[PDB]
Amino acid sequence: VNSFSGYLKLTDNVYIKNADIVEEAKKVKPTVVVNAANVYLKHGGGVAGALNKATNNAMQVESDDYIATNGPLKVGGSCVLSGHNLAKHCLHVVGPNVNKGEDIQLLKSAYENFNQHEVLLAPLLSAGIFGADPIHSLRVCVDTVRTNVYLAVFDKNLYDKLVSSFL
Ligand SMILES: O=C(O)[C@@H](O)[C@@H]1CCCN(c2ncnc3[nH]c4cc(F)ccc4c23)C1
Secondary structure, eight states: OOSOOSOEEOSSSEEEEEOOHHHHHHHHOOSEEEEEEOTTOOOOSHHHHHHHHHTTTHHHHHHHHHHHHHOOOOTTOEEEEEOTTTOSEEEEEEOOOGGGTOOTTHHHHHHHGGGGSSEEEEOOTTOGGGOOOHHHHHHHHHHHOOSEEEEEESOHHHHHHHHHTOO
């Protein structure tokens, strides 16, 4: 039993809710919140910009130190950093950004990072400003992630769609 509330169950291990991940996160304090990061951990907009804003820019300060030490992530890769006031940990995962021409096959590799964590609150990778089809993204998520994932979808219209077209 865990503290996540109001989700619809898609599979044994995938759940989904119309929610703001920032507000979903501040209430649950999940062990892991996933950020839809870029390779530079520059959290300017989308989920990343919102999450970072909710940390009063502490996420960005920590991220800049990480990059200064380690260099950029790989597309499809991830790193674990602090969750600040939102979660114990933040798993920064780089999905491919279609608006940069990145290969969509890397979306499966991106979701594989979720399997290193027993339970996660997460957005749909490569959705939103990253330009992928959130329905394809949901399919890859369901077919790749084996751990327990709670998907927060900000847009009510999108959500209702994803549900109605799910197989
Ligand atoms: O649409 C984008 O560009 C992306 O970021 C994707 C797709 C939809 C939005 N996004 C989220 N997914 C789940 N919760 C969210 N809360 C937010 C608050 C914001 F100010 C901006 C985006 C989100 C957000 C992931």
